[PDB]
């Protein structure tokens, strides 16, 4: 049930701007079969790197690409749900993690990070609608401010408002 592992952008799909890319489209019941099929590339002639599920058509669209691949257009669509591969999500930070988008969502001390959009416990100025450039989603530690500390999250701990998360840097 790896569907839970892959990253979900709801109400979102992708369109390829490059002709060379090939999309594997097939109607099924649920995105669960899409995830199972892309997981092991079932009948997939390529390196499946994302898939968009359409509930209206109940159809999988499998891609050897995803959002971070160049030449791809992000499209808001309520019937479209985009899913990206974590194993195709770089899980070490380049600099201050300014571009990092992986799903590590726990404080360095080991505390559960709070949802960004929610304001409990702590209200804050940083919001997805306000801040669309960095594209924080629910709890993924980010540094939209580009703070030296790296990606941080507002702790769900009432006592501590915020904490920088722990990532292994790509220290060559």
Partner 1 sequence: SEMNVNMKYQLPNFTAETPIQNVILHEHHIFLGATNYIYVLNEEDLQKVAEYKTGPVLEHPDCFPCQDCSSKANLVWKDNINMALVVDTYYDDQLISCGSVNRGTCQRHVADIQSEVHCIFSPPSQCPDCVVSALGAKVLSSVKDRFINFFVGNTINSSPLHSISVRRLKETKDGFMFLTDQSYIDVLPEFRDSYPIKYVHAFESNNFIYFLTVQRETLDAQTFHTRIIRFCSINSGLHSYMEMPLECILTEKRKKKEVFNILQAAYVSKPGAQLARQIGASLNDDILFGVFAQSKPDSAEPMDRSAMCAFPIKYVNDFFNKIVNKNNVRCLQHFYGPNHEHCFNDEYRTEFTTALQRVDLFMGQFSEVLLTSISTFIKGDLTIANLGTSEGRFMQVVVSRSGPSTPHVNFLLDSHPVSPEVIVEHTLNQNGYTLVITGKKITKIPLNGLGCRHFQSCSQCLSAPPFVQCGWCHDKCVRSEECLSGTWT
User: Where on the chain is the footprint of partner 1 (CB under 8 A)?
Assistant: 117-126, 129, 143, 145, 147, 149, 152, 158-159, 161-162, 164
- Secondary structure of residue 109 in the 3-state scheme: coil
Q: Please tell me whether residue 34 adopts helix, strand or coil conformation.
A: helix
Q: Is the dihedral of CA 7, 122, 160, 157 positive or negative?
A: negative
Q: Are 96 and 143 in contact (CB under 8 A)?
A: yes
Tokens of 112: 């559960």
Give the three-class secondary structure for 158: coil
CB of 124 to partner 1, least distance (A): 6
Joined tokens for residue 97: 């993690």
CB 106 within 8 A of CB 165: yes
CB of 11 to a copy of itself, least distance (A): 26
Per CB under 8 A, 44 contacts a copy of itself:
yes
**Residue 20 partner contact from partner 1, a copy of itself, none using kind-dependent CB cut-offs of 5 to 8 Å:** none
Contact status: 22 vs a copy of itself (CB under 8 A): no
- Footprint of a copy of itself on 103-162 (CB under 8 A): 103-104, 106, 108-112
Binding-site ranges for a copy of itself (CB under 8 A): 1-2, 5, 40-41, 44-48, 86-92, 94, 102-104, 106, 108-112, 166, 168, 170, 172
């Amino acid at each position: 049930n790896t569907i839970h592992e892959f990253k979900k952008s709801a109400k979102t799909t992708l369109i390829k701007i490059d002709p060379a890319l090939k999309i594997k489209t097939k109607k099924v019941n649920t995105a669960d079969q899409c995830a199972n099929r892309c997981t092991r590339n079932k009948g997939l002639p390529f390196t499946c790197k994302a898939f968009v599920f359409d509930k209206a058509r109940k159809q999988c669209l499998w891609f050897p690409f995803n959002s971070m691949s160049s030449g791809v257009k992000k499209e808001f669509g309520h019937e479209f749900d985009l899913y990206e591969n974590k194993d195709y999500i770089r899980n070490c930070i380049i600099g201050k993690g300014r571009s990092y988008k992986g799903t590590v969502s726990i404080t360095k001390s080991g505390i559960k990070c709070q949802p960004w959009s929610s304001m409990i416990p702590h209200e804050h100025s940083f919001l997805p609608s306000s801040y669309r450039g960095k594209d924080l989603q629910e709890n993924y530690c980010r540094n939209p401010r580009g703070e030296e500390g790296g990606p941080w999250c507002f702790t769900s701990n009432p006592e501590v408002r915020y904490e920088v998360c722990d990532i292994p840097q790509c220290s060559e």
